């Protein structure tokens, strides 16, 4: 799960 670390 990656949101922040992908944006």
Strand content: under 5%
Largest sheet: none
Cα-atom radius of gyration: 4 Å
Number of strands: 0
Form type: elongated
Work out the oligomeric state of the chains in this entry.
Answer: monomer
Name the helicity range.
under 10%
N- and C-termini, Cα separation: 12 Å
Helix run count: 0
Output the structural class. little secondary structure
PDB class: antimicrobial protein
Keywords: peptide CsrA-binding, antimicrobial protein
Assembly: monomeric
Entry title: NMR Solution Structure of a CsrA-binding peptide
Can you tell me about this structure?
This protein has 7 residues and is mostly loops. 0% of the residues lie in helices and 0% in strands. The protein has no helices and no strands.
Strand-helix topology:
Blueprint lengths: L7
PDB class: antimicrobial protein
Keywords: peptide CsrA-binding, antimicrobial protein
Assembly: monomeric
Supply the key terms.
elongated; about 5 residues; little secondary structure
Summarize the structure.
This protein is mostly loops.
